[PDB]
Structure formats: structure tokens, C-alpha cells
């Protein structure tokens, strides 16, 4: 057995890593509009920002894209 | 009395140039007003009934014991008690206190670029934040920014010059250029499309233009109260040159907040 | 007649008529150069104010509006605002 | 969100407090950390969280 | 009327040591309940209220950094002693003297009316937000309208002084000849004038936080960014409140080895080194929030190179005790003392000066023990030895000589037994601002707690060292308050003493 | 006198004589007052200064050692100099 | 206002070096990855890696051959 | 007179023991002469006790007036 | 023959602007004191 975490990005050098968190979450569905539902790296980037945010924030995020309170593009 | 005079002549005046003041009731009174003034502010933040009324006659007790002050100050330097030592003890007095002024307004602007140049995740990492219609530098403020040094330069006029004729309209034209950069700012304040609770943007704007703002009417009532001393007897001493001088640490303090807010989106 | 100022006076000279008149004019240039222009555009900015309207209604986004304390010292809305422009409805 | 790299050398049980003054109740928020074996954990602590 | 409407720089200095003093006696009485609360495990004389022992400590803190040793130091003796010192014969400007005294009395006032209100603020002595923010009600606007206050007096108090210093002196008297006490109170206005503005920003931010609903320290802003301004205002802050306690022990020194100062240069230098490298190295009150490497490396660097110049102040002390004649006195005692303990305060900052060691002893009562040290031994041991010093030439009464070596030994047993062992509790892992530990923690606790006790017996015995005073005929001296009578007339300086170099 | 350039010129001199005072031909020091505080350098080290005070009517008085030797007149008018003897310029 | 002692320049070297080391760091800050105000920064991922790396190293490079020689103390300490 | 500027600058004229000193202290050659207060010790020793008294108690009222609040 | 009734700094309104404000400014703080003590610590805050 061995243990699946969210590997480092050399994008994200500092101890403050929520950048990291909120660059995943929205590299998730950025894969998702682009490159279909079953993607791989679709999934990659779901286990990656599912690994880094707190379920507080990322709940909180969801109730922000379905009141449409969401900066993003897509 | 009439050899209170005599007195103070045989026993401080003759002796050294440096002036000896009579017992006086004012900072006392300025002390307690503080008092009283900021029980009634923290009534005021948290609603309480009767509260902006006590901040008010406290903050109105406090004016009344500044001009009295202020008054007996004029009245001694037309009494000739201040050499020339004295009056340049005032301008460096008010260097001083020009500092002092200056270090608070680089704080207030430390948290500007502290705050515009590293977006949150709570801003979703964007500044300005979405929602937020940024002032430009290319409308009214720029009008702002050449009167200001109009005013700039109205005010080292009436420092060199020694008609009094001159000096008066020199004054009352850096007055009454000061008096139209505040009416100008009160449109910016209504005719903006965000508010003091709209974002770290709306909070910093308004909270380093409203201090600044404050200075300028500070200033042009200095400036104001300056020229009536001068009105009166051709002559005004430190009170003019000080004056000059505060109004320009407002010039050069204004620099620094346009090119941060205005011109740098911070 | 007899006051401390004028008793000090001979011992603090003043450093040194057509000269000064030299300076207000050196100053006056400057002053000209941005004088008349900033006082006539802002006597025209003082005819062109409050006539102009935005009806850009703002999204209530969480950085909007903050209201950690119900309302303001003053009132509800903020102060100086005429007309508030982020949506209460949302929708 | 604030990271840190722990790597831990020996199997414990391992105290703390809470470092900042935060209530009434600061006083009475500790900290213990179990340590165990990697094989133990990756074959018998996470089959506990496995829905 | 006299004490009311004051504008004599000795009556406004005499009224700020009699509000120290007042100050210093409420610091040590909420000082006797955090050690009577700390001396068992469970629940003691508070009844298990939290929220009531953190007003207590952030009351104690705020009281004797602000209202004891400031209006002693640098309100107290500087005012009375600056203008006798350089031969001015009155402040710059002697009313603003006067409400430079007067906004300390609104502020106390202010403070100890915040502890009424509601369950009173709660939050240390930094007020850190969001526990500040937090805080329903009126009392945290109270006291931090307290700090604006007192604020306010220190800069009007800074810019009279610095206006004093440059344009009253003597003549004849450079900017080489004057002691350096004066050199110490100018330097500590300087940096008054620097810092406490930045702090009234900050603290205007805290207020349109709590009361105006704006973004300065919240959800989408910054709390960091108050921890940056607070700490740049106060790590000048504690140098504030040392450098007049440098010039008394110069001052003290000096006088009882019947010998000049040892490198006057090397002293100023040293001072304005120390002022200098204080406004570049704040943030190592911040090393546990999360800076990243290179700035905690930077301000890691930094902080030791304040080693260097106070090392050399305390070596040309010693230089200036070597090859004396020294008497030892009261005040002779409390400046060895001093240097003493002063140097054990300094060698604690140097370790917590490190970052990879000050990850383990942060927030715990390791930190309390090096600023327990630093501020009872420094700046408590300088008050002090001016009293005993300057008392006769101040208030008209002598000391008994006996007494006072019963307080210094009392006051130096209870201090010392005090804060030691809170070194072993900091290692060991106990943390600041609790009134409840584990089970282990009992006997440093119990043996500083003993401590505290001796402590507050020495401030009693204190009381009863006055007595009447002895009145002689002065010839000649080194510094100009000590030609003068004791009591010295309203008018001191009558005429306006020169200096006159000596001729070929 | 010395050079009065680089002096203020409400400085009361006397403190810029050129004379060192001995015990024969001390430095005479105007007072407005029956005695009066004045400052004296080390004349082999600058930074150390010493203030004595002078009484009328008594012998001459050095202060430092191998120093000037000083006696204290009373005088109403102390000369002023710097506007009072450079403006007569004798 | 005097003859700067021999000693002051002994302490000026490290005040100097202290102040250029606190103006090159609050310089280097306005350079650095996180203080960009868009969202569009990330979106290139090879010059975003190259100047976050770039800010890893700079500062840290002079300790790499010392941090794997495990060079912690003043002393060796096994 | 008795609100003219030479009042406000010069102040009074005042010459000799002003209300109830028994000593000069504005032209004396002491401005604190405590040892021509009458009954002096008494009264320096009660203002030093009320001094501590209070310096000591407020704190204590502080601590009993927040818990009689929670008490009720 | 150098002051004119428009003159603030007039000798005949010293006693109006030194004397009078002594008493009156000097009751008003004693009262405006008292009932903002009253008012922090006995009130409830509504905000
Ligand atoms: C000047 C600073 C100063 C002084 C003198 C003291 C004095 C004492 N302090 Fe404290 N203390 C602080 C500054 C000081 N303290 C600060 C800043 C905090 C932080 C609070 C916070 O975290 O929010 C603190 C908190 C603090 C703690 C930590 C509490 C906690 O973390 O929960 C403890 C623990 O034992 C303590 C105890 C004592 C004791 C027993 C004394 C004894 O020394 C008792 C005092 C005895 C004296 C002799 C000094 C009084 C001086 C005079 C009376 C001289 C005046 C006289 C004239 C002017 C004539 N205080
Ligand atoms: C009197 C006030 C005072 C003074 C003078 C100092 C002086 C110093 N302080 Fe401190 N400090 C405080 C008051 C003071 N401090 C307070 C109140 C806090 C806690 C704030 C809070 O409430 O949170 C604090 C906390 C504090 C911290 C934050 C740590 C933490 O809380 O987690 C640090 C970190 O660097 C520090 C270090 C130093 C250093 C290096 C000095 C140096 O200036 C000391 C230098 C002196 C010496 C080093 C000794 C003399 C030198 C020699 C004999 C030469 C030989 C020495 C060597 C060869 C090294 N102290
Ligand atoms: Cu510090
Ligand atoms: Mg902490």
C-alpha cells in the first residue's frame, strides 16, 4: 500500500500556500469545460485541490459559484 | 500690575532672550475635553442614544480651548514677547511636528501597498476586486493635482515678497485655491461607485484621502488665520511662515497619494 | 515702547527692494503656468457634476458590502451615498 | 494556509498546548500526536476511514 | 491652582513622577492577582474566569509599559532635569509642557473605566485582531482610545524636548558638553517622534475595523499587515524606555567614582547606534506567523548586531568604575545592579534573536523572563537609583540610608526569585497568557509566586525611607543641578550660566 | 577680544577675551546678582567641564586645575557684545 | 558635532551591511511570485515555475552544500 | 485694568505669601519648602496611605464589580 | 489707538474669552464628565 497526496508545485514557493488551494480548484474545472468530465488530469487536478483545501473553503466556494458569485470565466 | 512689567523686564527680559509664560488654565481643560470627547465617540460606534451629541460637545469644548489658546498666543506675539530666537523655536517646532505627520501618513499608506499589491484568496486573487470601478488619473483629479500646485506656487509667492499688498492677495489666493480642491473632493466622495465598506480598495482610498483632506482644511485655516494677523498690522512673523510651511508638507504629501492611489491602483 | 522685542532687536539683524519684486515674478511664471487652466476646468467640472447617472447595479460579492456590525454609526447606508449601487436582490 | 514538513524519527505519544491568546478558554485547548509504524498505518489506521 | 495651571518644567516633572508613581502602585496590585491566581494548579482566587484574568493581564501590561516607567523616565526626570542641564531657563514651549501632562490622566482614567464596561478588553497588551475585533462592545474602543491618548502626549512631550535641546542651550555649550542624560532623552524623542505616529494609524485601522465595517485586518484583508505596523512602532518602543535608564546610570556612575565618563564618544555613538538598527529589525516579534525564509533570515541576521553597542556601553561603565574612588551608596548599588542584571535580560534577547531556537520558546514564559529582566531590572532599577540620587535637590527631603538598603535588598531577593525559574518553565514548554498549566509546572510556580510576594513587601517598605532633609552651600560640581540650592528657587537659573573655553 | 566672526551677537562676552587669568591679573567676571554660576573647560582635555560659583567681594578663584584665576564684579549692564562694542568698532 | 571614534566605523561596516541587506529585501518583494494581482499569471506555467524557482534560490543557494552537510550548529555535534 | 494685555502677559503683580502658604514659592529661593508646612509628616504620611490605598484597591474593585455581574 | 471692535485679539473681550470660559467651560466638562461615565458604563449598546 501506498499513499496518494498532492505533489509540490514549483509555482507556489512560499509557507502561505492558499494560492496553491484556489489555483487547483480552478484548474479542476478549467479541465472540466475543456477537456470533457473523465479526463485524466481532470481527476488529477480534483485529488490535487481536494489534498490541499479545507472543506470549509471549498464548500464555501461551491455555494459562491451557484449563487454566480464566481470571478472565473467558465 | 503696572510693575508686573517691571518686573518681568529686571528679572527674565534683560537677561536672556527667551520668553517666561504667566500661569495658564487651557491644557487642563483641553485634557478633560479629550476625555469627555472620546467617551462620547465610543458611545457614538456602538449607537448608543445621546452619544454623537456628547462626542460633539466635547469636540466642540476642545475647538473653543484651542482658539482661546490660540488667542492669547497672538495677543503675546503682539505684545513683542518673541525675539527672533523664539520665532525660530516655532519653525522648528513645527518641523517637528511636520514629521510626526508625516510618519503617520507613510503608515496609512504602507497599508495601501501592502494590501493592492498581493490579492487575497478572500478577492479571489484580483485587484482591483470585480465590482469595483477604479478612479482615474486622467479626469478631475488631475485638475485637483494642478491646482494644488498652483496653490504650491501661490504660497512660495507670498513668502519673498514685501509689498503687503501682494503677500494679502497671495495669501488669499492659496486660501481660496485650498477651499476649491475640498469642494472638489466632496464630488469625488458622492459621485463615486464605491463606498468605505466596498473591498480593501474603497477602505483605503477613503481613509488616506479623508485624513488628507482633513490636512488640507487644517492648513487653509491656518493659513486663514495667519492672514488676519497680517491684515491688521503688516506684520506676522511666525505665523506666516509656518503656515507656508504646513501648507507645503500638504503639497508634498498629496504627491505621494496620487501617484499611490490614483496613478499606481493601490 | 519698551518691549522685549525691540530691546533683543539690534542683536538679531535681518539678512539683508527690486529683488524681491524679481522673485514674485519668478514665482508668479510658475504660478501661471497652472493657474488659470485648473481653475477653469474646475469651474467647468462644477457645471458638469451631479447631471451624469450609472445604472451598473454591482453583484453582492462577499468582499462587497461588509456588515460585520449591523449598519453604520449613522444610518443604514454609507455616508455620502446618494445611491446605492450593489444589487439587494439577488437573483 | 500556512505549510509545514514534519518527518518524525521515533513512535510516541506527544504533547502541546495552544500558543495564542485566543478567549477565555486559551487555556484549555491541547495538542496530543499519536505516532505509529508506516506499515501499521497503511494497513490497519486507514482501513478505519474507508467507507 | 499652583499644580493646576503649571507652566514651571520642575512642577510638571515633579506631577509626572507623583502619576508614575500612582501608576507603578496599580501595575504592582494587578500584578499580585496574576501571581496569586498562577501559584496552584485549578482554580484560585478568579474562580476559573478566563476572560477576567485576561483583562487583568492586558490592564497590568498596558499600565507599566505606559503610565510607570515612561512618565518616570522620560517625562519625570527629563523634564525636571533637561533645562538645568543645559542652562536653559525654562521648555520651548511651557504650556504645551502642560498638556503633554495633562492627556495622561484622561487616558488612565480611560483605561481603568474599560475594565467596568461589559467583560472589559480581554486581549494582551498588543491587541491583536480578530480577538480584538471580536469583542462586542465598548470597552476595547476605551482602551485603545487610552493608547491614542498617551500617544499624543509623547509626541507633544518629544517635540518640546528636541526644541529645548537645539535652541535653549547655554553659551558656549556645544553639542559635546552636554552629559549624557540629556544625549539619552534627546535620542528617546527622536525616536518617539518616529515611531508612535505609526501606531496611531494602526490604531485608527483597528477602530474603523471594529465600528466602521471597513477591510483593513478581516476576512478580505490582511492580519498580518497589523502585526507589521504594531511591531514597527514597538520594538522602538522598549528602547524608548531604556536609554533614559542608560543616561541615570551614566549619570550615577560617574558621580560616585569621582570620575568623568569613560569614551563619551563611544557612548553617543553607541546610543545612536542602538536608535538607528531599532526601526529595521521589528519582526522578530513575528517569526511564528509565516514570513517567508529570506525575510525571518534578514531580521534573524539583524536583531544580533544590537549586541555590539550595548556590550560596549556596559564595558565603558565599568571602564568608568575602574581606577576610581568609589563610595558605595544607594543609588551606587542600584546601577551596579543594573549593570548586573541588566546584562543577564540582554543575553536572553540574543537567543531569542535566533529564529530556529525562538520556534520553540515563542509565547511561552521564556520571553516573559528576558522582558521581566530587561524592564524590572532595567528600567525599574534606573527609576530608583534617580530617586535616591536627585531626591533631596527635587522634593526637599533626605532618606534614611538604612531603609533604603532594606528595600533595594528586599526588592532585589523578590525580583530575582521571581522571574528566574519562569526561564525553566519557558523551557520546558509552558505558555504565556494561561492561568491554568499541567501538574508539573507546580514548583517554579509556587517559588516565583513566593517571589512576588517579596516584591510587593519591597514596594511597601519603600514608603518609609523619607525623612527630613539636610541643607548645605554648593562651591563647585560637574553638572549644573548640583551648584544649585536643594530645594532650587521657582526661577532656577537666574542668571544664565556660559561656558568659557580656557585661552592660550 | 577674540575674532567675533562665527559669534552670536547676544552672547555677553568676556567669555571671548584674550586673557588667560593669574593670580595677579585675573579674568574680571560682570554679575547682575551678588553671585553668579559660570563654567570653566579642562585646559588639557575639552570634553571635561566644571561650574563654580563666584562671590563678590572674595579673593581670586581658579576652579580647575592649572585653569584662569576669576573675580566677579556687579555691574547693572552687562555689555552685550556683538552689537555693543563691534558696533562701535574702537 | 565631534570626532567619530575609531570604533565607530567597526560598528557602521555591519550597520551598513544591515541597512543594504533591509533595502534589497523590501526591493526583491515587488519581484517575487505571489505579488501579481491576476489570475492570468498562473496560466503560464513554465515562466511561473521559472520565477518561483527563481525566488527559491537566490538568498538559499549559498546555504545548499552547508544544509546537506548538516552545518547547523557551531560546534559538531555528531 | 484687570483684563488688560498686560495682565494676560506679564500676569499679576502679586507680591508675598499668596493664599495660605506660609512660604514664597514663586520669588523665594526654594520653590518646595517642606519644612514650613505646618503639621507636614502628618499630612504627607495620610497622602501617601490614600495613595496606596487607592493604587492598591482599584484593581480589587475591578475584580469584584465583573463578578458580582456574573453572580446574579 | 491700535484696536478696532472687529479685532478678535481686542483688550475688551478678554474677560468675555479668559474669565468667563474658566467657570463656564470648567462646569461644563465636570458635567459632560459625568454623564458619559454614566452613559459607558450603564448603557447598552445597540450596534
Ligand atoms: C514596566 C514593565 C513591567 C514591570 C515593572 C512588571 C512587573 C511585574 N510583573 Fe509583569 N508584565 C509586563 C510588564 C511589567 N511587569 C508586560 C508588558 C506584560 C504582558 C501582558 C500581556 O501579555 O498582555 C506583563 C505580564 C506579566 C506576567 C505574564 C502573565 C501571563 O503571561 O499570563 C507575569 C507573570 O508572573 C507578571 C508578573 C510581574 C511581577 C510579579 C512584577 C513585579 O516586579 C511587581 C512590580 C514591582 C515593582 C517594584 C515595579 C513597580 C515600580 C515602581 C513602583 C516604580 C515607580 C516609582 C516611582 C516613579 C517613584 N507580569
Ligand atoms: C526594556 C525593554 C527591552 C529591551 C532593552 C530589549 C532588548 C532586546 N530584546 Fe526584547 N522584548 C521586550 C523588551 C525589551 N527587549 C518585550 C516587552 C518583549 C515581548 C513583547 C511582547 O509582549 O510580546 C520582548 C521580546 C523580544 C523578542 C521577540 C521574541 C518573542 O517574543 O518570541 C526578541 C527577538 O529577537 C527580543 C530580543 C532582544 C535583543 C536581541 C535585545 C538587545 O537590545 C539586548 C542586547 C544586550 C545584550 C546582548 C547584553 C549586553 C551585551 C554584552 C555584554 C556583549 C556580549 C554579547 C555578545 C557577545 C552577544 N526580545
Ligand atoms: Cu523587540
Ligand atoms: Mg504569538
Given at each position: 500500500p501506498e499513499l496518494i497526496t498532492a505533489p509540490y508545485d514549483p509555482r507556489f514557493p512560499n509557507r502561505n500556500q492558499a494560492r496553491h488551494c484556489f489555483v487547483r480548484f480552478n484548474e479542476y474545472y478549467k479541465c472540466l469545460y475543456e477537456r470533457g468530465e473523465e479526463h485524466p488530469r481532470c481527476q488529477f487536478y480534483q485529488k490535487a485541490y481536494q489534498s490541499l483545501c479545507p472543506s470549509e473553503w471549498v464548500e464555501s466556494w461551491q455555494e459562491l459559484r451557484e449563487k454566480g458569485l464566481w470571478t472565473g470565466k467558465y | 500690575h503696572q510693575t508686573a512689567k517691571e518686573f518681568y523686564m529686571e528679572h527674565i527680559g534683560k537677561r536672556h532672550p527667551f520668553h517666561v509664560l504667566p500661569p495658564s488654565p487651557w491644557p487642563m481643560l483641553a485634557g478633560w475635553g479629550t476625555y469627555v470627547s472620546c467617551l462620547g465617540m465610543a458611545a457614538w460606534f456602538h449607537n448608543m442614544p445621546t452619544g454623537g451629541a456628547l462626542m460633539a460637545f466635547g469636540m466642540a469644548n476642545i475647538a473653543w480651548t484651542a482658539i482661546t489658546w490660540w488667542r492669547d498666543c497672538a495677543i503675546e506675539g503682539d505684545m513683542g514677547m518673541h525675539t527672533e530666537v523664539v520665532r525660530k523655536n516655532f519653525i522648528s517646532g513645527m518641523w517637528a511636528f511636520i514629521v510626526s505627520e508625516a510618519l503617520l501618513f507613510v503608515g496609512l499608506l504602507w497599508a495601501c501597498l501592502h494590501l493592492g499589491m498581493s490579492p487575497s484568496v478572500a478577492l479571489q486573487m484580483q485587484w482591483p476586486p470585480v465590482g469595483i470601478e477604479p478612479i482615474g488619473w486622467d479626469k478631475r483629479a488631475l485638475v485637483m493635482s494642478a491646482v494644488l500646485a498652483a496653490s504650491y506656487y501661490s504660497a512660495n509667492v507670498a513668502m519673498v515678497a514685501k509689498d503687503p499688498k501682494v503677500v494679502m492677495g497671495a495669501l488669499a489666493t492659496t486660501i481660496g485655491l485650498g477651499a476649491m480642491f475640498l469642494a472638489d473632493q466632496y464630488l469625488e466622495y458622492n459621485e463615486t461607485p464605491f463606498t468605505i465598506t466596498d473591498s480593501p480598495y474603497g477602505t483605503t482610498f477613503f481613509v488616506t484621502t479623508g485624513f488628507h483632506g482633513m490636512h488640507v482644511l487644517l492648513g487653509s485655516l491656518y493659513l486663514t488665520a495667519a492672514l488676519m494677523m497680517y491684515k491688521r498690522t503688516h506684520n506676522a512673523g511666525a505665523a506666516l511662515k509656518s503656515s507656508i510651511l504646513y501648507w507645503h508638507f500638504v503639497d508634498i504629501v498629496w504627491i505621494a497619494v496620487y501617484g499611490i492611489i490614483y496613478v499606481g491602483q493601490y | 515702547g519698551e518691549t522685549i522685542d525691540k530691546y533683543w532687536a539690534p542683536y538679531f539683524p535681518k539678512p539683508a527692494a527690486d529683488e524681491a519684486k524679481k522673485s514674485v515674478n519668478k514665482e508668479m511664471v510658475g504660478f501661471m503656468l497652472l493657474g488659470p487652466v485648473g481653475v477653469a476646468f474646475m469651474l467647468y467640472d462644477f457645471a458638469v457634476g451631479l447631471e451624469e447617472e450609472h445604472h451598473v447595479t454591482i453583484p453582492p460579492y462577499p468582499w462587497m458590502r461588509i456588515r460585520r456590525l449591523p449598519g453604520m454609526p449613522w444610518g443604514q447606508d454609507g455616508l455620502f451615498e446618494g445611491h446605492p449601487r450593489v444589487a439587494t436582490t439577488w437573483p | 494556509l500556512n505549510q509545514v514538513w514534519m518527518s518524525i524519527n521515533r513512535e510516541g505519544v506527544f504533547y502541546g498546548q495552544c500558543s495564542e491568546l485566543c478567549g477565555a478558554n486559551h487555556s484549555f485547548m491541547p495538542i496530543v500526536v499519536e505516532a505509529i509504524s508506516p506499515r501499521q498505518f497503511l494497513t490497519e489506521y486507514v482501513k478505519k476511514w474507508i467507507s | 491652582?499652583?499644580?493646576?495651571?503649571?507652566?514651571?518644567?520642575?512642577?510638571?516633572?515633579?506631577?509626572?513622577?507623583?502619576?508614575?508613581?500612582?501608576?507603578?502602585?496599580?501595575?504592582?496590585?494587578?500584578?499580585?492577582?496574576?501571581?496569586?491566581?498562577?501559584?496552584?494548579?485549578?482554580?484560585?482566587?478568579?474562580?476559573?474566569?478566563?476572560?477576567?484574568?485576561?483583562?487583568?493581564?492586558?490592564?497590568?501590561?498596558?499600565?507599566?509599559?505606559?503610565?510607570?516607567?515612561?512618565?518616570?523616565?522620560?517625562?519625570?526626570?527629563?523634564?525636571?532635569?533637561?533645562?538645568?542641564?543645559?542652562?536653559?531657563?525654562?521648555?520651548?514651549?511651557?504650556?504645551?509642557?502642560?498638556?503633554?501632562?495633562?492627556?495622561?490622566?484622561?487616558?488612565?482614567?480611560?483605561?481603568?473605566?474599560?475594565?467596568?464596561?461589559?467583560?472589559?478588553?480581554?486581549?494582551?497588551?498588543?491587541?491583536?485582531?480578530?480577538?480584538?475585533?471580536?469583542?462586542?462592545?465598548?470597552?476595547?474602543?476605551?482602551?485603545?482610545?487610552?493608547?491614542?491618548?498617551?500617544?499624543?502626549?509623547?509626541?507633544?512631550?518629544?517635540?518640546?524636548?528636541?526644541?529645548?535641546?537645539?535652541?535653549?542651550?547655554?553659551?558656549?555649550?556645544?553639542?559635546?558638553?552636554?552629559?549624557?542624560?540629556?544625549?539619552?532623552?534627546?535620542?528617546?524623542?527622536?525616536?518617539?517622534?518616529?515611531?508612535?505616529?505609526?501606531?496611531?494609524?494602526?490604531?485608527?485601522?483597528?477602530?474603523?475595523?471594529?465600528?466602521?465595517?471597513?477591510?483593513?485586518?478581516?476576512?478580505?484583508?490582511?492580519?498580518?499587515?497589523?502585526?507589521?505596523?504594531?511591531?514597527?512602532?514597538?520594538?522602538?518602543?522598549?528602547?524608548?524606555?531604556?536609554?533614559?535608564?542608560?543616561?541615570?546610570?551614566?549619570?550615577?556612575?560617574?558621580?560616585?567614582?569621582?570620575?568623568?565618563?569613560?569614551?563619551?564618544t563611544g557612548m553617543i555613538c553607541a546610543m545612536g547606534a542602538i536608535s538607528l538598527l531599532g526601526f529595521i529589525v521589528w519582526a522578530h516579534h513575528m517569526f511564528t506567523v509565516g514570513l517567508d525564509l529570506d525575510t525571518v533570515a534578514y531580521f534573524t541576521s539583524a536583531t544580533m548586531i544590537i549586541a555590539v553597542p550595548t556590550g560596549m556601553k556596559i564595558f565603558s561603565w565599568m571602564a568608568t568604575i575602574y581606577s576610581g574612588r568609589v563610595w558605595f551608596t544607594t543609588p551606587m548599588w542600584f546601577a551596579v545592579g543594573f549593570i548586573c542584571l541588566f546584562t543577564l535580560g540582554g543575553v536572553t534577547g540574543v537567543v531569542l534573536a535566533n529564529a530556529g531556537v525562538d520556534m520553540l520558546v515563542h509565547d511561552t514564559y521564556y520571553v516573559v523572563a528576558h522582558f521581566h529582566?530587561?524592564?524590572?531590572?532595567?528600567?525599574?532599577?534606573?527609576?530608583?537609583?534617580?530617586?535616591?540620587?536627585?531626591?533631596?535637590?527635587?522634593?526637599?527631603?533626605?532618606?534614611?540610608?538604612?531603609?533604603?538598603?532594606?528595600?533595594?535588598?528586599?526588592?532585589?531577593?523578590?525580583?530575582?526569585?521571581?522571574?528566574?525559574?519562569?526561564?525553566?518553565?519557558?523551557?520546558?514548554?509552558?505558555?504565556?497568557?494561561?492561568?491554568?498549566?499541567?501538574?508539573?509546572?507546580?514548583?517554579?510556580?509556587?517559588?516565583?509566586?513566593?517571589?512576588?510576594?517579596?516584591?510587593?513587601?519591597?514596594?511597601?517598605?519603600?514608603?518609609?525611607?523619607?525623612?527630613?532633609?539636610?541643607?548645605?552651600?554648593?562651591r563647585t560640581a560637574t553638572t549644573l543641578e548640583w551648584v544649585l540650592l536643594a530645594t532650587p528657587a521657582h526661577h532656577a537659573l537666574s542668571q544664565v550660566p556660559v561656558l568659557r573655553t580656557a585661552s592660550s | 577680544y577674540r575674532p567675533l566672526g562665527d559669534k552670536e551677537l547676544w552672547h555677553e562676552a568676556w567669555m571671548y577675551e584674550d586673557k588667560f587669568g593669574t593670580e595677579e591679573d585675573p579674568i574680571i567676571v560682570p554679575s547682575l546678582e551678588a553671585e553668579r554660576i559660570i563654567g570653566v573647560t579642562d585646559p588639557e582635555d575639552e570634553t571635561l567641564v566644571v561650574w563654580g560659583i563666584l562671590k563678590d567681594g572674595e579673593p581670586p578663584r581658579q576652579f580647575v586645575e592649572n585653569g584662569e584665576f576669576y573675580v566677579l564684579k556687579h555691574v547693572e549692564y552687562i555689555k552685550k557684545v556683538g552689537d555693543v562694542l563691534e558696533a562701535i568698532e574702537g | 558635532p565631534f570626532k567619530l571614534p575609531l570604533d565607530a566605523y567597526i560598528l557602521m561596516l555591519p550597520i551598513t551591511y544591515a541597512s543594504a541587506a533591509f533595502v534589497a529585501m523590501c526591493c526583491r518583494v515587488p519581484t517575487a511570485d505571489p505579488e501579481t494581482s491576476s489570475i492570468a499569471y498562473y496560466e503560464d506555467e513554465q515562466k511561473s515555475a521559472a520565477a518561483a524557482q527563481r525566488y527559491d534560490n537566490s538568498f538559499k543557494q549559498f546555504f545548499d552544500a552547508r544544509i546537506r552537510n548538516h552545518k547547523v550548529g557551531v560546534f559538531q555535534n555528531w | 485694568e484687570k483684563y488688560s494685555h498686560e495682565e494676560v502677559v506679564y500676569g499679576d503683580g502679586h507680591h508675598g505669601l499668596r493664599k495660605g502658604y506660609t512660604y514664597d514659592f514663586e520669588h523665594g529661593p526654594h520653590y518646595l519648602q517642606p519644612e514650613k508646612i505646618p503639621n507636614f509628616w502628618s499630612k504627607f504620611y495620610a497622602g501617601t496611605g490614600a495613595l496606596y490605598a487607592v493604587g492598591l484597591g482599584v484593581p480589587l474593585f475591578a475584580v469584584w464589580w465583573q463578578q458580582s455581574k456574573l453572580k446574579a | 489707538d491700535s484696536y478696532k471692535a472687529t479685532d478678535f485679539t481686542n483688550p475688551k473681550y478678554n474677560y468675555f474669552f479668559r474669565e468667563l470660559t474658566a467657570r463656564v467651560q470648567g462646569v461644563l466638562l465636570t458635567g459632560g464628565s459625568l454623564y458619559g461615565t454614566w452613559l459607558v458604563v450603564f448603557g447598552e449598546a445597540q450596534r
Open positions: - | - | - | - | 491652582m499652583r499644580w493646576l495651571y503649571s507652566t514651571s518644567h520642575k512642577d510638571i516633572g515633579l506631577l509626572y513622577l507623583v502619576f508614575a508613581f500612582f501608576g507603578g502602585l496599580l501595575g504592582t496590585s494587578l500584578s499580585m492577582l496574576i501571581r496569586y491566581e498562577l501559584a496552584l494548579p485549578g482554580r484560585g482566587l478568579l474562580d476559573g474566569n478566563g476572560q477576567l484574568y485576561n483583562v487583568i493581564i492586558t490592564g497590568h501590561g498596558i499600565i507599566m509599559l505606559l503610565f510607570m516607567v515612561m512618565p518616570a523616565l522620560f517625562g519625570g526626570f527629563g523634564n525636571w532635569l533637561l533645562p538645568i542641564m543645559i542652562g536653559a531657563p525654562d521648555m520651548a514651549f511651557p504650556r504645551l509642557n502642560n498638556i503633554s501632562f495633562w492627556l495622561n490622566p484622561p487616558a488612565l482614567a480611560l483605561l481603568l473605566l474599560s475594565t467596568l464596561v461589559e467583560q472589559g478588553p480581554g486581549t494582551g497588551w498588543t491587541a491583536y485582531p480578530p480577538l480584538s475585533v471580536q469583542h462586542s462592545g465598548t470597552s476595547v474602543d476605551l482602551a485603545i482610545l487610552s493608547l491614542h491618548l498617551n500617544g499624543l502626549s509623547s509626541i507633544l512631550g518629544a517635540v518640546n524636548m528636541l526644541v529645548t535641546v537645539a535652541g535653549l542651550r547655554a553659551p558656549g555649550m556645544k553639542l559635546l558638553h552636554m552629559p549624557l542624560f540629556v544625549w539619552a532623552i534627546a535620542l528617546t524623542a527622536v525616536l518617539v517622534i518616529l515611531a508612535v505616529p505609526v501606531l496611531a494609524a494602526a490604531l485608527v485601522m483597528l477602530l474603523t475595523d471594529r465600528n466602521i465595517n471597513t477591510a483593513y485586518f478581516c476576512e478580505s484583508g490582511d492580519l498580518i499587515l497589523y502585526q507589521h505596523l504594531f511591531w514597527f512602532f514597538g520594538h522602538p518602543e522598549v528602547y524608548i524606555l531604556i536609554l533614559p535608564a542608560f543616561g541615570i546610570v551614566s549619570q550615577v556612575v560617574s558621580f560616585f567614582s569621582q570620575k568623568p565618563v569613560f569614551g563619551l529582566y530587561v524592564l524590572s531590572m532595567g528600567a525599574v532599577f534606573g527609576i530608583f537609583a534617580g530617586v535616591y540620587f536627585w531626591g533631596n535637590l527635587i522634593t526637599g527631603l533626605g532618606y534614611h540610608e538604612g531603609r533604603a538598603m532594606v528595600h533595594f535588598w528586599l526588592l532585589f531577593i523578590g525580583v530575582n526569585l521571581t522571574f528566574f525559574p519562569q526561564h525553566f518553565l519557558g523551557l520546558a514548554g509552558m505558555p504565556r497568557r494561561m492561568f491554568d498549566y499541567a501538574d508539573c509546572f507546580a514548583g517554579w510556580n509556587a517559588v516565583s509566586s513566593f517571589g512576588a510576594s517579596i516584591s510587593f513587601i519591597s514596594v511597601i517598605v519603600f514608603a518609609t525611607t523619607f525623612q527630613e532633609a539636610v541643607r548645605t552651600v554648593p | - | - | - | -
